[PDB]
Ligand binder design. Structure first.
Ligand code: MG
Ligand code: MG
Ligand code: MG
Ligand code: MG
Ligand code: MG
Ligand code: MG
Ligand code: ZN
Lengths: 217, 322, 132
RNA sequence: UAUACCGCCAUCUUCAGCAAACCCUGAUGAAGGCUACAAAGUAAGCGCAAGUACCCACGUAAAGACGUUAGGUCAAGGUGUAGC
């Protein structure tokens, strides 16, 4: 019996200090604006991409920062309501780092081979009463093969607020809160993982503080 | 002889031949006219030893034969089966509602309505022509909640319930304005099925395909004219109708996008104009570009109906009731 | 295609009992021996008569108990008798069961001059073992 | 009357698949669902497998699954119609 959880967090912009978690200069230091070639670039990814440097796409960091703020606020509000987050990755370039981050965070992850529809038929494959993932964060939307991951399809079929760092190949229209930017460099991935971890930790701390404030009564 | 005696289920299976029980004969009451302390008398409370005449036993056997005949007659009891569209067919027939979910989701409110049935014969490596069946069922009570589905299999009830579950997992919604008529007209061209709908008022009548009539009854639309142009493909026609219903411009959204109010001069009422929708913030003070003689590609059927030039042996004849 | 006692599969929904769910070659591996008599030795007489009596008593007990048998019978021999171990299906009342048992016992005793006392094992549901 | 069956047996069978219940795809068509440096397939159930006997678990024994052959049998018993 605590209806204040549906009004207190959703009131002030950046309740958990979302914009302060990252920085425009810190993001630019990772060279996330870089992208693939125009040929590899996707059609629907044109509005989010700014220009090109000798066929090297550049993404305006302002829209990326706005999308990151939105996604971080969404994830913090979800954690405030106690929800499951699922990390996806298949490039095998930083799988160990993503696993360590998932271990540090208070959620689950799955960056390995995704069998044929594990979330759709979760009634029979998984347990009958399983808390399905309420959020998805893509660490590498592009798997080993040049093919859009099925996670977006399962989400659209299950209606889940999808999050992730879309590259210049996938379809951001299928993702709810896309985040244009590089998805290959190491410093960028490390910064994104650290930002997600800090956001989750601060959201949990604020949730505990609000619970204590409620208990003060 | 005794060697010529075996079970009875085997003999029954043999007599039936479908390849390429002791009810009347009581076990308690002796088949020979006799009385005993056990049964047929006060259950041990006048416990004696008597005997019935053979005529009484023959009468008891005749009574058992009459009971068998009564059971056989009961087996001949007829039943009521509503005819769907075509006589003795599962056209526009209805059945029970879909089953709930595991944790809940009482989907019993929705109503099922089988549409078409087709027997497909596809040869195989050894089984031969597989008697596969494909069905397209549409479930939905109304108020926008509805949706079609498909469920092919080599059975009947199994395929029906599979299609019902698929429809439950595939619920389509259609933005409506006053449950009676669609927002505006639609002139689509789904693959090879044309859909020419016309906005009509209440009490006008359902002038559309029987399948479309059932779809509208399930959705909620009461009456609306529709010219079923092009070929008559059930699956493609239904898919195109669903696509058109999903692609519709509402009044509130259109007003919010453009800004201008909805001006109208209804003939039923007086010249008093009544706004139907208003913007959600701004208001385009400038009027629309009233450019006369616009480029609205109307249909020839519209002109034929407005000028009454359409004439045939089946133009606008009286149709059935209900 | 030989099809002795082994049942041909068709769909995984065949409520077969325990004894019925066994091939006819597992008599020395999984399946035991139902009826027993010295006639099947190397070599003792009294075989044809024993087999005939067993086959007759099986059908007799199956007819006297219409549908009240969860599975096949298991004959035995102890003295001048023929014990019959059966898994009766709880169908009729115990009074009727006792009456029929006594009647059959007396009839067999006065007919074959051999008190063929049987044994029951009331079980409501059939002992389903596999879904062939 | 077995080219109407129960029941029985024979080749393929020198084989490896056969399927209930689900999910995805083909602008949602009859239909297909395989790529482990992994692209949608999960698969209780039957069988191969597996397991068990003489001299072991080997050699010898039991099984050779769904199905073509309307495979043969009124000829071991009854058996859809007819009749002496
Ligand atoms: Mg008719
Ligand atoms: Mg023959
Ligand atoms: Mg062979
Ligand atoms: Mg063998
Ligand atoms: Mg065997
Ligand atoms: Mg022949
Ligand atoms: Zn990309």
């Amino acid at each position: 019996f605590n209806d204040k959880i549906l009004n207190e967090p959703l009131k002030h912009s950046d309740f958990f200090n979302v914009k302060e978690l990252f920085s425009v200069r810190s993001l630019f230091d990772a060279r996330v604006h870089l992208g693939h070639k125009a040929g590899c670039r996707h059609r629907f990814m044109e509005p989010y991409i700014f220009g090109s440097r000798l066929d090297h796409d550049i993404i305006d960091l302002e829209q990326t920062a706005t999308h990151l703020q939105l996604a971080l606020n969404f994830t913090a509000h979800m954690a405030y309501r106690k929800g499951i987050i699922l990390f996806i990755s298949r490039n095998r370039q930083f799988s160990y780092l993503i696993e360590n981050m998932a271990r540090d965070c208070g959620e689950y992850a799955h960056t390995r081979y995704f069998r044929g529809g594990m979330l759709t038929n979760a009634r029979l494959l998984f347990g009958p009463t399983v808390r399905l993932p309420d959020l998805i964060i893509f660490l590498h939307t592009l798997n080993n093969i040049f093919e859009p991951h099925v996670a977006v399809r399962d989400a659209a079929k299950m209606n889940i607020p999808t999050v992730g760092i879309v590259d210049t190949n996938c379809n951001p229209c299928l993702i709810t809160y896309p985040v244009p930017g590089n998805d290959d460099s190491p410093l960028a991935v490390h910064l994104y993982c650290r930002l997600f971890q800090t956001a989750i930790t601060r959201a949990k701390e604020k949730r505990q503080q609000v619970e204590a404030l409620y208990r003060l009564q | 002889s005794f060697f010529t005696k075996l079970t009875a289920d085997e003999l029954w299976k043999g007599a039936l031949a479908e390849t390429g029980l002791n009810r009347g004969q009581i076990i308690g009451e002796g088949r020979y006219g006799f009385l005993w302390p056990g049964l047929n008398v006060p259950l041990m409370k006048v416990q004696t030893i008597a005997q019935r005449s053979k005529e009484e036993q023959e009468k008891v056997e005749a009574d058992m034969i009459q009971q068998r005949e009564e059971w056989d007659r009961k087996k001949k009891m007829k039943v009521k089966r509503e005819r769907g569209w075509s006589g003795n067919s599962w056209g526009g027939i209805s059945l029970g509602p879909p089953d709930p979910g595991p944790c809940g989701e009482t989907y019993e409110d929705f109503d099922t309505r089988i549409l078409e049935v087709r027997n497909v014969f596809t040869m195989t490596a050894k089984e031969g022509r597989k008697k596969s069946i494909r069905v397209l069922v549409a479930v939905g009570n109304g108020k926008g909640a509805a949706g079609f589905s498909i469920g092919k299999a080599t059975d009947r009830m199994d395929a029906f319930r599979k299609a019902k579950n698929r429809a439950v997992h595939h619920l389509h919604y259609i933005e409506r304005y006053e449950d009676h008529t669609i927002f505006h007209d639609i002139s689509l061209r789904f693959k090879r099925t044309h859909i020419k709908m016309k906005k009509q008022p209440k009490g006008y009548g359902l002038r559309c395909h029987r399948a479309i009539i059932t779809i509208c009854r399930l959705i909620g639309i009461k009456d609306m004219y529709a010219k079923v142009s092009g070929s008559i493909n059930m699956l493609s026609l239904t898919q195109g109708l669903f696509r058109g219903l999903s692609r519709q411009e509402t009044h509130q959204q259109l007003a919010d996008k453009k800004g201008l109010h909805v001006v109208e001069i209804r003939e039923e009422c007086g010249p008093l104009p009544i706004v139907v929708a208003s913007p959600r913030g701004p208001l385009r003070k400038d009027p629309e570009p009233e450019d006369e003689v616009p480029d609205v590609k109307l249909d020839w059927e519209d002109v034929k109906t407005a000028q009454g030039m359409k004439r045939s042996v089946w133009s606008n004849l009286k149709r059935a009731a209900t | 295609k030989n099809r002795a006692a082994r049942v041909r599969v068709s769909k995984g929904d065949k409520p077969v009992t325990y004894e019925e769910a066994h091939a006819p070659h597992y008599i020395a591996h999984r399946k035991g021996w139902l009826s027993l008599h010295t006639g099947n030795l190397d070599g003792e007489d009294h075989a044809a008569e024993r087999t005939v009596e067993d086959v007759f008593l099986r059908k007799f007990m199956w007819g006297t108990f219409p549908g009240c048998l969860a599975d096949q019978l298991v004959l035995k021999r102890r003295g001048n008798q023929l014990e019959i171990c059966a898994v009766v299906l709880r169908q009729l009342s115990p009074h009727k069961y006792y009456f029929l048992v006594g009647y059959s016992e007396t009839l067999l005793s006065y007919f074959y001059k051999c008190p063929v006392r049987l044994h029951l094992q009331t079980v409501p549901s059939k002992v389903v073992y596999k879904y062939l």
